[PDB]
Amino acid sequence: HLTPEEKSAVTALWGKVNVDEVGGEALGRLLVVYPWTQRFFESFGDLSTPDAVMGNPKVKAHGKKVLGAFSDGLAHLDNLKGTFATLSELHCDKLHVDPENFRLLGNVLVCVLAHHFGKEFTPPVQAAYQKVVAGVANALAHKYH
Amino acid sequence: HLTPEEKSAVTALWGKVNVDEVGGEALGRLLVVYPWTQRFFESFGDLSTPDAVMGNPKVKAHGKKVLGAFSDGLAHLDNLKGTFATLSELHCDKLHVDPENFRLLGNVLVCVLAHHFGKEFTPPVQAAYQKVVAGVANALAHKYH
Amino acid sequence: LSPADKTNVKAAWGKVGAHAGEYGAEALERMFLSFPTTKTYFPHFDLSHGSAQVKGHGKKVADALTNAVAHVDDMPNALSALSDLHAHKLRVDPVNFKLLSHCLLVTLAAHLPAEFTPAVHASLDKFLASVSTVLTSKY
Amino acid sequence: LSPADKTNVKAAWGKVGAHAGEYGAEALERMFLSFPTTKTYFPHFDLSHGSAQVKGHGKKVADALTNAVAHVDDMPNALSALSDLHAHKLRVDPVNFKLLSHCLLVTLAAHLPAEFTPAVHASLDKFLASVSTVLTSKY
Ligand code: HEM
Ligand code: HEM
Ligand code: HEM
Ligand code: HEM
């Protein structure tokens, strides 16, 4: 449910995203700011400090996949349900992640984009992305609905 | 997404519902327990006490309509989106009620049913209704999605 | 918590008496059945009906709530060690405290016809939010 | 709030300096554009870009946050009159305090490249939740 102007705002910024770094930057901040999400990443090892989390290679590798999923969603804003169906089954029926954490991860991502783009991440640009991350979270939670 | 057993649990109990009283009992408790929802019912008059709210005729009359909407949803558990489309437009595009209050009203209703049916509102019976009220709230919030 | 809120919570709940252990067990089962995401915090429990572990744990939950009403004016210090447990060791998702609180209200409603008035309902919800706030204050 | 959290919040935020009034205005606009449900609390504001009322109110919001960090160990008493206002007179939906907090973090991120570290980000989020908790504690 994006306008041409919001689509224009979202893709222009996304083209500048370092897809090898932004995913892990957001997953790490999630694990640091909302430390109960670490419950799902016991295997990742050292999450004992903020530095440990951010510099942890497993966090960076995984976030890259997460950002891979967001990129796919951006390319299918009109069928986010189908795009995230298998990820929904995984995160819902298998992992039992409360869907409120999807919203949090999405908002954390918004903070990462604001951090890296500064003035360029304008209030209108943010509004468009809040729609995007809301839709992803809702799609990823479809198996609860 | 209800099973035959959950449908059986939900309709058997609903048939015993006093549809002239339960709606207003739940809207009133909403206005008392989460008093910021009164912001949307300034016209209703005296909401200054719990007794005032519950005994307020406008609260009873309106809750009857709300419970009317829930009954319709129970009869169309497989197309809740279409059922609540016009109510979604009203509560979303026009009233701008945050959808978190839909979840609250639904859970308040669950409390009212437990209050009036006691032991009969078993944990399995509750589980079925939590699915129902979750679906209603999600349907009523579709215009935000 | 207002003085009336405290009065109501001592009331609602004096009436729970020696059923308090059985009511907490029922609250958990209600939470496990209605919100299955919460069951992953108890992989080592048998969460079936009549489970000795759910009963035993429901008693601990109810006793902690008893201790909270008994020290309602200093709950952060009374619930201090439970705050560390739920946040540090268990990292309980804060969402889950709302789910159990709702099931605790449902359980009380279904067992206290006369006590669960709109006002008492409101007071109990404020009480459980304060307990939840304390148990989530240590992340 | 841990001692490190307080250190970080005095830091992040010392750097906000005399922009604090302009940052709160930007936070509100971010909230109004991203979460339009919040605009119904300001029917009497002109919520357009560059509105003198949004600027004036953003300064009040930022000043209240300044007062909170200046009394971080006794925020309930410092934010006491704002708690009554937001809960009693305005009945602000508690959900909305999370929306404005998120926009306050976004605003800071976009204006403080160096300060918005993961740790400072975590501390600021704890700070704003405590302020939110205080401002919602009076329903
Ligand atoms: C909100 C948007 C999210 C997206 C787009 C996303 C995306 C992904 C992707 C692409 C994978 C890889 C699946 C595969 O390898 O086949 C994954 C796995 C995983 N996710 Fe997420 N995720 C999100 C939120 C979360 C949250 C909030 C948590 C926990 C608090 C979480 C926990 C996990 C875990 C534990 C795995 C590993 C599953 C396994 O390997 O068995 N995810 N996610
Ligand atoms: C969660 C399930 C809900 C259902 C099923 C529901 C149902 C209804 C119904 C049937 C009407 C009457 C519409 C008409 O007369 O054409 C209505 C109106 C209204 N509802 Fe709800 N409602 C819900 C939640 C809420 C909540 C949580 C609030 C506020 C906090 C709210 C505020 C209102 C208001 C203010 C009106 C009057 C609108 C007008 O007359 O212009 N509703 N609702
Ligand atoms: C009002 C809310 C709550 C109260 C009063 C409470 C109280 C308690 C108590 C008294 C214990 C036992 C501590 C001990 O024996 O050392 C405990 C442990 C535990 N709690 Fe809670 N709790 C609450 C909410 C929750 C929620 C919402 C969850 C998860 C969704 C949860 C999950 C657990 C788990 C997994 C344990 C450990 C059980 C075991 O290992 O035997 N608690 N809690
Ligand atoms: C950290 C969170 C917040 C802080 C520090 C804050 C602070 C303030 C301050 C200082 C005032 C002015 C009081 C006066 O001049 O007497 C105010 C008023 C107001 N606040 Fe907030 N607030 C917060 C959150 C919110 C939220 C989330 C909403 C709505 C979504 C909101 C809506 C309002 C409104 C409508 C007014 C009255 C404006 C007017 O009539 O001019 N506030 N707040």
What's the 3-state SS for C55-68? Answer: HHHHHHHHHHHHHH
Tell me the CA distances in angstroms from C108 to A120, A122, B25, B116, C60, one per residue in order: 53, 49, 17, 12, 17
With the most atoms of ligand 3 within 8 angstroms of its CB, the residue from C33, C83, C90 to mutate is C90
Q: Which of C65, C69, C101, C78 minimizes the C-alpha distance to C5? A: C69
Among chain B residues, the shortest Cα distance to D99 is held by B98
In this complex, do D106 and A50 lie within 8 Å of one another by their Cβ atoms? Answer: no
With a 6 Å cutoff on the Cβ, whether C79 touches ligand 3 is no
Tell whether D133 is within 8 A of chain C (Cβ).
yes
Tell whether A101 is within 8 A of chain C (Cβ).
yes
SS3 (DSSP) at C16: coil
In this complex, do C139 and A39 lie within 8 Å of one another by their Cβ atoms? Answer: no
In this complex, do B96 and D37 lie within 8 Å of one another by their Cβ atoms? Answer: yes
Q: Cα(D92) to centroid of ligand 4, in Å?
A: 9
Kindly report the nearest CA distance between residue B143 and chain A, in angstroms: 10
- Read off φ and ψ for residue B141, nearest 5 degrees: -100, 5
**For C133, which of D126, D133, D139 is closest by C-beta distance?**
D133
Sequence-separated (6 or more) residues with CB below 8 Å from residue B87? B69, B140
Q: Cα(A126) to centroid of ligand 1, in Å?
A: 24
Sequence-separated (6 or more) residues with CB below 8 Å from residue C85? none
**For D118, which of A54, A127, A130 is closest by C-beta distance?**
A54
Q: DSSP letters along D71-121, please?
A: TGGGHHHHTHHHHHIIIIIS---HHHHHHHHHHHHHHHHHH-TTT--HHHH
Is C86 assigned a ligand-binding role in the annotation?
A: yes
Elucidation method: X-ray
Task: Give me Rg for the CA atoms of chain C.
Answer: 14
With a 6 Å cutoff on the Cβ, whether D92 touches ligand 4 is yes
**For D109, which of A32, A50, A114 is closest by C-beta distance?**
A114
Sequence-separated (6 or more) residues with CB below 8 Å from residue D107? A114, D23, D24, D26, D27, D30
Resolution (angstroms) stands at 2.3
How far is Cα A105 from Cα D128, in angstroms, rounded to an integer? 18
How far is Cα D61 from Cα C66, in angstroms, rounded to an integer? 40
Give the closest residue (by CA) to ligand 2 atom 42: B91
Answer whether A136's CB lies under 8 Å from A70's CB: yes
Sequence-separated (6 or more) residues with CB below 8 Å from residue A20? A64
The single-letter code of the amino acid at C47 is: L
End-to-end CA distance of chain D: 24
Tell whether B38 is within 8 A of chain C (Cβ).
no
Query: Which residues in chain B are contacts of A134 at CB distance < 8 A?
Result: 144-145
Domain holding D134, by residue range, is 1-139
- Tell the burial category of C59 from Cβ atoms under 10 Å away from its Cβ (0-12, 13-18, 19+): middle
Give the domains, in start order, of chain B with CATH numbers: 1-145 (1.10.490.10)
Q: Give the other-Cβ count within 10 Å of C89's Cβ.
A: 8
With a 6 Å cutoff on the Cβ, whether A24 touches ligand 1 is no
In this complex, do C29 and B50 lie within 8 Å of one another by their Cβ atoms? Answer: no
Question: What would the two tokens of residue A94 be?
Answer: 């298998």
How far is Cα B101 from Cα B138, in angstroms, rounded to an integer? 11
How far is Cα C47 from Cα B67, in angstroms, rounded to an integer? 34
With a 6 Å cutoff on the Cβ, whether D97 touches ligand 4 is yes
Tell whether B29 is within 8 A of chain C (Cβ).
yes
Could you tell me which chains touch chain C, where touching means 3 or more CB pairs under 8 A? Answer: A, B, D
Q: Give the other-Cβ count within 10 Å of C45's Cβ.
A: 16
Tell me the CA distances in angstroms from D22 to D14, D16, D56, one per residue in order: 15, 10, 9
Q: Give the other-Cβ count within 10 Å of D59's Cβ.
A: 16
Could you tell me which chains touch chain D, where touching means 3 or more CB pairs under 8 A? Answer: A, B, C
CATH number of domain containing D65: 1.10.490.10
Query: Which residues in chain C are contacts of A98 at CB distance < 8 A?
Result: 37, 93, 95-96
Sequence-separated (6 or more) residues with CB below 8 Å from residue D70? D78
Give the distance, in angstroms, between the CA of residue A24 and the centroid of all CA atoms in the same chain: 10
How far is Cα D51 from Cα D40, in angstroms, rounded to an integer? 16
How far is Cα D67 from Cα D76, in angstroms, rounded to an integer? 11
How far is Cα A3 from Cα A9, in angstroms, rounded to an integer? 10
In this complex, do A98 and C92 lie within 8 Å of one another by their Cβ atoms? Answer: no
Answer whether D20's CB lies under 8 Å from D79's CB: no
Q: How many domains does chain C have?
A: 1
At which residue do the structure tokens 């951006």 appear? A74
With a 6 Å cutoff on the Cβ, whether A140 touches ligand 1 is yes
Cβ burial D32-47 (10 Å sphere, 16+ → b, else e)? bbbbebbeebeeebeb
Answer whether D57's CB lies under 8 Å from D45's CB: yes
Q: B100-117 and B22-33 are packed helices; what angle lies between their axes, rounded to 10 degrees?
A: 120
Give the closest residue (by CA) to ligand 4 atom 32: D41
